[PDB]
Amino acid sequence: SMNPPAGPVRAIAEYERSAAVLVRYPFGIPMELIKELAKNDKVITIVASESQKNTVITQYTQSGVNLSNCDFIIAKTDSYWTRDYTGWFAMYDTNKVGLVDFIYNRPRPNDDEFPKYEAQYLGIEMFGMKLKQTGGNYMTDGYGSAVQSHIAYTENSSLSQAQVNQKMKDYLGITHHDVVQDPNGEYINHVDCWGKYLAPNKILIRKVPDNHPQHQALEDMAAYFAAQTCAWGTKYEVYRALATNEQPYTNSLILNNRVFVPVNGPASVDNDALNVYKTAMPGYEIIGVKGASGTPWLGTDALHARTHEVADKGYLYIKHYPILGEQAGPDYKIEADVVSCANATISPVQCYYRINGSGSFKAADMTMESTGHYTYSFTGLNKNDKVEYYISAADNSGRKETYPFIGEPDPFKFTCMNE
Ligand SMILES: NC(=[NH2+])NCCC[C@H](N)C(=O)O
Ligand code: NA
């Protein structure tokens, strides 16, 4: 249809549960990357025909790819930039997952048409947001914020900024459309070449040497996010990836509990960038990925550009705003909504917690106050006790999720003040 999705709407972040990753043949990525992806995750390869599917299968077979995780969509495409032209995922109507199409900002009509085939393959509804856009210039935090470079306005110049924001609100639930002047000074003007949310409370911003002409622009961008309160209420943790030679270190893919980071030398500088991700994202497997010689990584175009995560149409979604830092008390009550997009019975919903850093985490069942709305109150705590906690839910479709996604390795932390 030509109507927007039934609300409420919530755009899905890249670090939420993904059912798959979407890539295209003829390839722009190394076979070793496809192999590593398919070890743990479903890889959907776009091909133009049944014969082309079988050509790809032959190559996957030769390369030892886990075929059990290889799936295909038959559709014409102009390019391998699946980041930029495939559809955007959003929850809508409380418990549904939908796809949002847009006008691809390139003269690539097959790429532009592609989202309809994606929605058909996935069995989800598609909604048409009439803005000139590109996935490389889009990221959301999963809490209603999105960051884009200025082309989101300038390539939609027949609309006011207000009208652009309103389209993002209506189709994606974006209530904070953070559009900023691109700090990189190159043609492409995609956020994925300088910035990346790593979690709702973490953003990676590119850094360059002091004498690079964009040094100050990037420092100003880092400062802007560091001054900003995030969805969870704390200031963003701002991480920096140092590009000494225009390496595309921000152009990474977060797929479930792994992070694929393009690397292109020198080795020490690549390792420094991997180390930033490792520090920022405990519990994640951080993987450096060398480029293919025929389609190498570039400053403006690397791994993120040539992949697109795919949401789970049956997503078991946990909505939670954490209690963090110095908390007054005397009640320490957490609240979470849990929605099963599989329409499955949810049970159990638990708080896993640890007090003062010792032993194992302990499970307590949360109490369902009203439909889909769960709470839990931390009892018996003394002034200055430190709490680590995370939420865990399961449903009878077999799904199991934690909040945060990674769970126990990176729990929410607060301190009981009793004041
Ligand atoms: N998400 C990205 N960084 N995409 C890079 C796209 C590169 C391609 N040459 C273009 O300008 O269309
Ligand atoms: Na499109």
Numbering used by the authors: 47 to 465
Study authors write:
To this end, citrullination by the only known prokaryotic PAD expressed by keystone periodontal pathogen Porphyromonas gingivalis (PPAD) has been implicated in the aetiology of RA. PPAD is organised into four domains: the N-terminal signal peptide (NtSP, aa 1-48), catalytic/deiminase domain (CD, aa 49-360), Ig-like fold (IgLF, aa 361-463) and C-terminal domain (CTD, aa 464-556). The CD adopts the canonical fold of ββαβ motifs conserved among GME structures (RMSD 2.0–2.4 Å). The PPAD active site is an elongated cavity with its entrance exposed to the surface exterior.
We have determined the 1.46 Å and 1.48 Å structures of tPPADWT and tPPADC351A by molecular replacement, which reveal identical and superimposable conformations (root mean square deviation (RMSD)∼0.09 Å), suggesting that the Cys351Ala substitution did not perturb protein integrity. The crystallised tPPADWT and tPPADC351A constructs include residues aa464–484, with no visible electron density. This region represents a flexible linker connecting the IgLF and CTD in the full-length polypeptide, and its flexibility likely caused disorder in the crystal.
